[PDB]
Write a protein that binds this ligand. Structure first.
Ligand SMILES: Nc1nc2c(ncn2[C@@H]2O[C@H](COP(=O)(O)OP(=O)(O)O)[C@@H](O)[C@H]2O)c(=O)[nH]1
Ligand SMILES: [Mg+2]
Length: 305
């Protein structure tokens, strides 16, 4: 019986609590504690499609050797679920996946769900710290945005990446590895196609710095590029009104929009295929499951005092 485990939470006193006992129970088990880890995080605001997406990532991780891992077209969705509260923090999946690479060594896959809002100036520090810790631990950060990538989205991205930099060890190269803009309800396929190719051209125009841009407009883009060695973008279509208006969607897979499943079938392996798995690195050293827990404990202690 696997499920989501609340690892990081923000108490009402605006302090940060890390469930170390739950962290150790998952990542320090003898079967996985000494294995190089890949940490994939889906980060975004509440009610933006994160749990619905990660249930399909689980379907892929539990059925990688199946062609139709998404499920039966005529039957409801099957498998474990994150969709069990608007809690600002980080959740991880209780089961760590051991993936045999094309090589002969087993790699560990950790899945993270990061949640928080940047709406008001009051809840800004709490969500910035949570999203910072998510970016510092994960090897791929999936920025889950809705409809478009707006300027405030980049400002917030600059905010929690700057929080993370101030706590990390100083590095000559870039501090983080992979950032991905996941635009969830893309409604302009006639400008940029659904998927990674359209997202690449879209993000190219968005994060382009030009001399006619405002000073604040270019400087936030210079910062974002300096933080990640790779930055990607995937334009995902709308899943349909049955998914959008149902809390915890339980209908048949047929009732999800066909274009959504088509691009979802290529989004998930684009993220989690064994060939694309890059080991998490901190300060230039490949991190193991045991080491990732140590950095999580070390980073959280810096933000407390
Ligand atoms: N418009 C839209 N709605 C979605 C999408 N994915 C899920 N939903 C629906 O929107 C609501 C989001 O809930 P959920 O994703 O579980 O919450 P979250 O994990 O905190 O973002 C649910 O009712 C879903 O059925 C999406 O890509 N676009
Ligand atoms: Mg969630």
């Amino acid at each position: 019986k696997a499920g989501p485990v609340q690892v990081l939470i923000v108490k009402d006193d605006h302090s940060f609590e890390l469930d170390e006992t739950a962290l150790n129970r998952i990542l320090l088990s003898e079967a996985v504690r000494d294995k190089e880890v890949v940490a994939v995080s889906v980060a975004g605001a509440f009610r933006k499609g994160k749990s619905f997406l990660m249930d399909f990532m689980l379907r892929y991780m539990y059925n990688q050797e199946s062609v139709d891992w998404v499920g039966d077209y005529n039957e409801p969705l099957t498998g474990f679920s994150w969709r069990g509260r608007e809690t600002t923090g980080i959740q991880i999946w209780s089961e760590i996946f051991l993936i045999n690479k094309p090589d002969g060594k087993k790699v560990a896959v950790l899945l993270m769900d990061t949640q928080g809002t940047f709406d008001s100036q009051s809840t800004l520090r709490d969500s910035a710290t949570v999203f910072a810790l998510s970016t510092m631990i994960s090897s791929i950060q999936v920025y889950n945005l809705s409809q478009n990538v707006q300027e405030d989205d980049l400002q917030h991205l600059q905010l929690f990446t700057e929080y993370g930099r101030l706590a990390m060890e100083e590095t000559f190269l870039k501090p983080f590895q992979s950032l991905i803009f996941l635009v969830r309800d893309w409604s302009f396929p006639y400008e940029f196609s659904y998927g990674a190719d359209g997202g690449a051209k879209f993000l190219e125009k968005r994060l382009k710095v030009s001399g006619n841009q405002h000073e604040e407009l270019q400087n936030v883009r210079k910062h974002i590029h300096s933080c990640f060695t790779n930055i990607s973008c995937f334009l995902l279509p709308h899943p349909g009104l049955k998914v959008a208006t149902n809390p915890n969607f339980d209908g048949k897979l047929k009732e999800i929009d066909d274009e959504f499943i088509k691009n979802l079938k290529i989004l998930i392996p684009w993220l989690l295929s064994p060939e694309s798995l890059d080991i998490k690195e901190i300060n230039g050293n490949k991190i193991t499951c045991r080491g990732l827990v140590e950095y999580f404990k070390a980073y959280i202690k810096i933000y407390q005092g």
